[PDB]
PDB file of all heavy atoms in Angstrom:
ATOM      1  N   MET A   1     -20.925 130.887 -39.018  1.00 55.08           N
ATOM      2  CA  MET A   1     -20.934 131.188 -40.465  1.00 55.08           C
ATOM      3  C   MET A   1     -21.718 130.098 -41.197  1.00 55.08           C
ATOM      4  O   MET A   1     -22.645 130.427 -41.925  1.00 55.08           O
ATOM      5  CB  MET A   1     -19.512 131.260 -41.017  1.00 55.08           C
ATOM      6  CG  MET A   1     -18.728 132.440 -40.496  1.00 55.08           C
ATOM      7  SD  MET A   1     -17.062 132.555 -41.206  1.00 55.08           S
ATOM      8  CE  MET A   1     -17.490 132.833 -42.924  1.00 55.08           C
ATOM      9  N   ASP A   2     -21.334 128.852 -40.988  1.00 58.30           N
ATOM     10  CA  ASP A   2     -21.867 127.673 -41.716  1.00 58.30           C
ATOM     11  C   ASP A   2     -23.334 127.469 -41.298  1.00 58.30           C
ATOM     12  O   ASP A   2     -24.234 127.478 -42.193  1.00 58.30           O
ATOM     13  CB  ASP A   2     -20.945 126.491 -41.431  1.00 58.30           C
ATOM     14  CG  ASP A   2     -21.167 125.260 -42.286  1.00 58.30           C
ATOM     15  OD1 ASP A   2     -22.007 125.324 -43.219  1.00 58.30           O
ATOM     16  OD2 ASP A   2     -20.488 124.248 -42.002  1.00 58.30           O
ATOM     17  N   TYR A   3     -23.577 127.331 -39.988  1.00 58.91           N
ATOM     18  CA  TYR A   3     -24.896 126.997 -39.399  1.00 58.91           C
ATOM     19  C   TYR A   3     -25.753 128.249 -39.239  1.00 58.91           C
ATOM     20  O   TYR A   3     -26.926 128.179 -39.538  1.00 58.91           O
ATOM     21  CB  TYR A   3     -24.727 126.267 -38.066  1.00 58.91           C
ATOM     22  CG  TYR A   3     -23.879 125.016 -38.131  1.00 58.91           C
ATOM     23  CD1 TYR A   3     -23.355 124.467 -36.979  1.00 58.91           C
ATOM     24  CD2 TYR A   3     -23.639 124.337 -39.327  1.00 58.91           C
ATOM     25  CE1 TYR A   3     -22.627 123.287 -36.999  1.00 58.91           C
ATOM     26  CE2 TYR A   3     -22.868 123.189 -39.374  1.00 58.91           C
ATOM     27  CZ  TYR A   3     -22.371 122.650 -38.197  1.00 58.91           C
ATOM     28  OH  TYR A   3     -21.630 121.500 -38.226  1.00 58.91           O
ATOM     29  N   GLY A   4     -25.184 129.351 -38.772  1.00 57.07           N
ATOM     30  CA  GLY A   4     -25.945 130.569 -38.456  1.00 57.07           C
ATOM     31  C   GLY A   4     -26.008 131.523 -39.636  1.00 57.07           C
ATOM     32  O   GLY A   4     -26.528 132.634 -39.435  1.00 57.07           O
ATOM     33  N   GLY A   5     -25.429 131.151 -40.784  1.00 54.98           N
ATOM     34  CA  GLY A   5     -25.397 132.040 -41.981  1.00 54.98           C
ATOM     35  C   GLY A   5     -24.728 133.382 -41.721  1.00 54.98           C
ATOM     36  O   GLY A   5     -24.978 134.308 -42.486  1.00 54.98           O
ATOM     37  N   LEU A   6     -23.933 133.525 -40.649  1.00 54.87           N
ATOM     38  CA  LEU A   6     -23.248 134.816 -40.354  1.00 54.87           C
ATOM     39  C   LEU A   6     -22.169 135.030 -41.415  1.00 54.87           C
ATOM     40  O   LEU A   6     -21.773 134.049 -42.036  1.00 54.87           O
ATOM     41  CB  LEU A   6     -22.664 134.841 -38.935  1.00 54.87           C
ATOM     42  CG  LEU A   6     -23.657 134.911 -37.762  1.00 54.87           C
ATOM     43  CD1 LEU A   6     -23.076 135.705 -36.617  1.00 54.87           C
ATOM     44  CD2 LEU A   6     -24.986 135.543 -38.145  1.00 54.87           C
ATOM     45  N   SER A   7     -21.792 136.282 -41.687  1.00 54.22           N
ATOM     46  CA  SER A   7     -20.575 136.644 -42.457  1.00 54.22           C
ATOM     47  C   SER A   7     -19.363 136.450 -41.534  1.00 54.22           C
ATOM     48  O   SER A   7     -19.600 136.367 -40.276  1.00 54.22           O
ATOM     49  CB  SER A   7     -20.622 138.042 -42.954  1.00 54.22           C
ATOM     50  OG  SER A   7     -20.365 138.934 -41.892  1.00 54.22           O
ATOM     51  N   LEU A   8     -18.147 136.419 -42.111  1.00 53.13           N
ATOM     52  CA  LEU A   8     -16.887 136.338 -41.327  1.00 53.13           C
ATOM     53  C   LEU A   8     -16.871 137.460 -40.273  1.00 53.13           C
ATOM     54  O   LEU A   8     -16.617 137.152 -39.101  1.00 53.13           O
ATOM     55  CB  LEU A   8     -15.665 136.424 -42.253  1.00 53.13           C
ATOM     56  CG  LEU A   8     -14.325 136.511 -41.498  1.00 53.13           C
ATOM     57  CD1 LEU A   8     -14.155 135.308 -40.580  1.00 53.13           C
ATOM     58  CD2 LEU A   8     -13.136 136.623 -42.443  1.00 53.13           C
ATOM     59  N   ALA A   9     -17.115 138.707 -40.687  1.00 51.98           N
ATOM     60  CA  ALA A   9     -17.031 139.910 -39.819  1.00 51.98           C
ATOM     61  C   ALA A   9     -18.104 139.837 -38.727  1.00 51.98           C
ATOM     62  O   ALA A   9     -17.847 140.293 -37.622  1.00 51.98           O
ATOM     63  CB  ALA A   9     -17.192 141.168 -40.641  1.00 51.98           C
ATOM     64  N   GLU A  10     -19.278 139.294 -39.043  1.00 51.11           N
ATOM     65  CA  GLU A  10     -20.415 139.112 -38.098  1.00 51.11           C
ATOM     66  C   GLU A  10     -20.080 138.033 -37.069  1.00 51.11           C
ATOM     67  O   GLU A  10     -20.319 138.255 -35.896  1.00 51.11           O
ATOM     68  CB  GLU A  10     -21.691 138.685 -38.827  1.00 51.11           C
ATOM     69  CG  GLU A  10     -22.319 139.818 -39.620  1.00 51.11           C
ATOM     70  CD  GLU A  10     -23.372 139.414 -40.644  1.00 51.11           C
ATOM     71  OE1 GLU A  10     -23.906 138.269 -40.588  1.00 51.11           O
ATOM     72  OE2 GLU A  10     -23.644 140.250 -41.511  1.00 51.11           O
ATOM     73  N   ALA A  11     -19.644 136.859 -37.518  1.00 49.51           N
ATOM     74  CA  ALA A  11     -19.172 135.751 -36.652  1.00 49.51           C
ATOM     75  C   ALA A  11     -18.028 136.251 -35.743  1.00 49.51           C
ATOM     76  O   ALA A  11     -18.020 135.942 -34.565  1.00 49.51           O
ATOM     77  CB  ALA A  11     -18.765 134.579 -37.522  1.00 49.51           C
ATOM     78  N   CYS A  12     -17.126 137.082 -36.245  1.00 53.08           N
ATOM     79  CA  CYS A  12     -16.007 137.635 -35.424  1.00 53.08           C
ATOM     80  C   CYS A  12     -16.515 138.631 -34.363  1.00 53.08           C
ATOM     81  O   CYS A  12     -16.008 138.599 -33.202  1.00 53.08           O
ATOM     82  CB  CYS A  12     -14.965 138.257 -36.327  1.00 53.08           C
ATOM     83  SG  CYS A  12     -14.009 137.008 -37.207  1.00 53.08           S
ATOM     84  N   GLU A  13     -17.524 139.429 -34.684  1.00 50.22           N
ATOM     85  CA  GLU A  13     -18.151 140.401 -33.740  1.00 50.22           C
ATOM     86  C   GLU A  13     -18.867 139.643 -32.612  1.00 50.22           C
ATOM     87  O   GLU A  13     -18.642 139.960 -31.398  1.00 50.22           O
ATOM     88  CB  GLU A  13     -19.093 141.316 -34.528  1.00 50.22           C
ATOM     89  CG  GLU A  13     -19.745 142.431 -33.721  1.00 50.22           C
ATOM     90  CD  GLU A  13     -18.864 143.603 -33.302  1.00 50.22           C
ATOM     91  OE1 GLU A  13     -17.900 143.898 -34.022  1.00 50.22           O
ATOM     92  OE2 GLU A  13     -19.213 144.269 -32.285  1.00 50.22           O
ATOM     93  N   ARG A  14     -19.734 138.699 -32.975  1.00 49.79           N
ATOM     94  CA  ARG A  14     -20.460 137.834 -32.005  1.00 49.79           C
ATOM     95  C   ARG A  14     -19.449 137.249 -31.008  1.00 49.79           C
ATOM     96  O   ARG A  14     -19.655 137.426 -29.777  1.00 49.79           O
ATOM     97  CB  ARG A  14     -21.215 136.710 -32.736  1.00 49.79           C
ATOM     98  CG  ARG A  14     -21.969 135.742 -31.832  1.00 49.79           C
ATOM     99  CD  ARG A  14     -23.380 136.203 -31.514  1.00 49.79           C
ATOM    100  NE  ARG A  14     -24.219 136.221 -32.711  1.00 49.79           N
ATOM    101  CZ  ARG A  14     -24.953 135.204 -33.164  1.00 49.79           C
ATOM    102  NH1 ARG A  14     -24.960 134.044 -32.520  1.00 49.79           N
ATOM    103  NH2 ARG A  14     -25.661 135.357 -34.276  1.00 49.79           N
ATOM    104  N   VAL A  15     -18.372 136.635 -31.514  1.00 51.03           N
ATOM    105  CA  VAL A  15     -17.468 135.820 -30.660  1.00 51.03           C
ATOM    106  C   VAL A  15     -16.585 136.757 -29.837  1.00 51.03           C
ATOM    107  O   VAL A  15     -16.566 136.600 -28.623  1.00 51.03           O
ATOM    108  CB  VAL A  15     -16.639 134.799 -31.465  1.00 51.03           C
ATOM    109  CG1 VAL A  15     -15.533 134.170 -30.620  1.00 51.03           C
ATOM    110  CG2 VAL A  15     -17.528 133.713 -32.031  1.00 51.03           C
ATOM    111  N   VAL A  16     -15.875 137.682 -30.482  1.00 49.13           N
ATOM    112  CA  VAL A  16     -14.757 138.416 -29.823  1.00 49.13           C
ATOM    113  C   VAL A  16     -15.318 139.561 -28.998  1.00 49.13           C
ATOM    114  O   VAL A  16     -14.777 139.774 -27.899  1.00 49.13           O
ATOM    115  CB  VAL A  16     -13.687 138.902 -30.823  1.00 49.13           C
ATOM    116  CG1 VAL A  16     -12.637 139.758 -30.118  1.00 49.13           C
ATOM    117  CG2 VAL A  16     -13.039 137.727 -31.557  1.00 49.13           C
ATOM    118  N   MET A  17     -16.307 140.294 -29.511  1.00 48.97           N
ATOM    119  CA  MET A  17     -16.785 141.558 -28.869  1.00 48.97           C
ATOM    120  C   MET A  17     -17.946 141.292 -27.891  1.00 48.97           C
ATOM    121  O   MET A  17     -18.167 142.134 -27.045  1.00 48.97           O
ATOM    122  CB  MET A  17     -17.193 142.587 -29.930  1.00 48.97           C
ATOM    123  CG  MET A  17     -16.074 142.899 -30.924  1.00 48.97           C
ATOM    124  SD  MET A  17     -14.427 143.240 -30.149  1.00 48.97           S
ATOM    125  CE  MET A  17     -14.840 144.593 -29.054  1.00 48.97           C
ATOM    126  N   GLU A  18     -18.634 140.146 -27.987  1.00 48.99           N
ATOM    127  CA  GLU A  18     -19.864 139.831 -27.221  1.00 48.99           C
ATOM    128  C   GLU A  18     -19.658 138.604 -26.328  1.00 48.99           C
ATOM    129  O   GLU A  18     -19.612 138.773 -25.117  1.00 48.99           O
ATOM    130  CB  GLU A  18     -21.022 139.546 -28.183  1.00 48.99           C
ATOM    131  CG  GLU A  18     -21.519 140.763 -28.934  1.00 48.99           C
ATOM    132  CD  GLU A  18     -22.678 140.500 -29.889  1.00 48.99           C
ATOM    133  OE1 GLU A  18     -23.313 139.408 -29.829  1.00 48.99           O
ATOM    134  OE2 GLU A  18     -22.948 141.385 -30.711  1.00 48.99           O
ATOM    135  N   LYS A  19     -19.554 137.412 -26.927  1.00 48.39           N
ATOM    136  CA  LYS A  19     -19.655 136.104 -26.227  1.00 48.39           C
ATOM    137  C   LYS A  19     -18.498 135.955 -25.231  1.00 48.39           C
ATOM    138  O   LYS A  19     -18.760 135.527 -24.093  1.00 48.39           O
ATOM    139  CB  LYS A  19     -19.717 134.931 -27.222  1.00 48.39           C
ATOM    140  CG  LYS A  19     -21.010 134.860 -28.026  1.00 48.39           C
ATOM    141  CD  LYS A  19     -21.098 133.685 -28.990  1.00 48.39           C
ATOM    142  CE  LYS A  19     -21.253 132.342 -28.299  1.00 48.39           C
ATOM    143  NZ  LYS A  19     -21.165 131.213 -29.258  1.00 48.39           N
ATOM    144  N   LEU A  20     -17.273 136.300 -25.622  1.00 49.40           N
ATOM    145  CA  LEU A  20     -16.073 136.065 -24.769  1.00 49.40           C
ATOM    146  C   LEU A  20     -16.005 137.079 -23.619  1.00 49.40           C
ATOM    147  O   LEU A  20     -15.731 136.710 -22.476  1.00 49.40           O
ATOM    148  CB  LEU A  20     -14.821 136.071 -25.656  1.00 49.40           C
ATOM    149  CG  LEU A  20     -14.783 134.963 -26.717  1.00 49.40           C
ATOM    150  CD1 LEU A  20     -13.676 135.199 -27.745  1.00 49.40           C
ATOM    151  CD2 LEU A  20     -14.661 133.571 -26.090  1.00 49.40           C
ATOM    152  N   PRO A  21     -16.213 138.398 -23.834  1.00 51.83           N
ATOM    153  CA  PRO A  21     -16.313 139.321 -22.700  1.00 51.83           C
ATOM    154  C   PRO A  21     -17.327 138.843 -21.640  1.00 51.83           C
ATOM    155  O   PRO A  21     -17.016 138.936 -20.434  1.00 51.83           O
ATOM    156  CB  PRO A  21     -16.765 140.631 -23.364  1.00 51.83           C
ATOM    157  CG  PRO A  21     -16.143 140.554 -24.749  1.00 51.83           C
ATOM    158  CD  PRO A  21     -16.243 139.087 -25.132  1.00 51.83           C
ATOM    159  N   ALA A  22     -18.466 138.294 -22.093  1.00 54.51           N
ATOM    160  CA  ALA A  22     -19.587 137.844 -21.223  1.00 54.51           C
ATOM    161  C   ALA A  22     -19.157 136.623 -20.407  1.00 54.51           C
ATOM    162  O   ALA A  22     -19.778 136.393 -19.363  1.00 54.51           O
ATOM    163  CB  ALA A  22     -20.841 137.536 -22.023  1.00 54.51           C
ATOM    164  N   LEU A  23     -18.179 135.839 -20.886  1.00 51.72           N
ATOM    165  CA  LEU A  23     -17.557 134.723 -20.106  1.00 51.72           C
ATOM    166  C   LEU A  23     -16.343 135.246 -19.327  1.00 51.72           C
ATOM    167  O   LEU A  23     -15.590 134.431 -18.768  1.00 51.72           O
ATOM    168  CB  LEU A  23     -17.157 133.587 -21.056  1.00 51.72           C
ATOM    169  CG  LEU A  23     -18.295 132.715 -21.598  1.00 51.72           C
ATOM    170  CD1 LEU A  23     -17.717 131.506 -22.330  1.00 51.72           C
ATOM    171  CD2 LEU A  23     -19.258 132.252 -20.512  1.00 51.72           C
ATOM    172  N   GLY A  24     -16.126 136.562 -19.347  1.00 56.26           N
ATOM    173  CA  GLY A  24     -15.018 137.219 -18.639  1.00 56.26           C
ATOM    174  C   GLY A  24     -13.686 136.899 -19.286  1.00 56.26           C
ATOM    175  O   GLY A  24     -12.689 136.782 -18.528  1.00 56.26           O
TER     176      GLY A  24
END
């Protein structure tokens, strides 16, 4: 949000739906 200018909902999508599944 702070560094990447993402919105709350965007930062939550990146982390929960994308980045964490990819780390299993």
